[PDB]
Amino acid sequence: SELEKAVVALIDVFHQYSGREGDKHKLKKSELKELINNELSHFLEEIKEQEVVDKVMETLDSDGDGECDFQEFMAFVAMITTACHEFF
Amino acid sequence: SELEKAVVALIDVFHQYSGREGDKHKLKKSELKELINNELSHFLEEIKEQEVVDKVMETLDSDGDGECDFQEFMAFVAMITTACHEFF
Ligand SMILES: [Ca+2]
Ligand SMILES: [Ca+2]
Ligand SMILES: [Ca+2]
Ligand SMILES: [Ca+2]
Incomplete structure (x- = not known):
């Protein structure tokens, strides 16, 4: 279904970016910056500072380790999705 | 991007199902049952009882009104996605 494809896409995009450097299962700042700039260009202003x-x-870092894990990433997606559902 | 398409799909599927009966912005039990059975057949056992x-x-009903709103639906998606990210 489109919903199942959406679930697969969320897993895949997180892992593409989290796997670049350091912990392969968390997003460091540089990885999160590239994810937003490359993959969320319609929903969020490009990050340049x-x-x-x-x-x-x-x-996004609820647990304070300085990185974005999968659960924190899901909370971010929920923010984005809700902002979109409510833009209209 | 695939991530943007995923966000659009989550909004669309929720609204397809929430709009069927009663509150057009919440899922009643019958609507949630059909969403799971029709759209999550690879991830969840068919609901027959x-x-x-x-x-x-x-x-799923965190706020206790007996229905699943958009925020509660996002929490459900996060459950499913995490279970999948961790199945492997
Ligand atoms: Ca990493
Ligand atoms: Ca963290
Ligand atoms: Ca409804
Ligand atoms: Ca509710």
């Missing part, structure tokens, strides 16, 4: 990268990570 | 419908709704 360290201050914005820092603030985004600070927001 | 009232007891299972009831228990699923009870689990």
Whole structure:
């Protein structure tokens, strides 16, 4: 179904980016920056300043280890999706 | 991107099902049952008993109004996606 394909896509995109550097199952700041800039260009302003990268990570990093894990990424997707469902 | 397409798909599937009966922005039990059976057949056992419908709704309905709203649906998707990311 389209829903199953959506679930597969969320897993795949997280792993494409999380696997680049360091912990292969978490997004460091550089990985999260590239994910947003490359994959969310219709929904979010391009990130071009360290201050914005820092603030985004600070927001998403609920457990405070400085990285975005899969559960934190799902919370981010839920934010984006809700903002879209409510833009209209 | 595939991520943007995934976000659009989550909004679309919720609205296809939520719009059938009653509140057009929430899933009642019958709507949630059909969503799971029709759209999540690879990830979840088909629901064939009232007891299972009831228990699923009870689990997803965080705010206790007896229906699944968009935020509760996103939490459900996060459950499914995490179970999949961890099946392997
Ligand atoms: Ca990483
Ligand atoms: Ca974290
Ligand atoms: Ca409804
Ligand atoms: Ca509810």
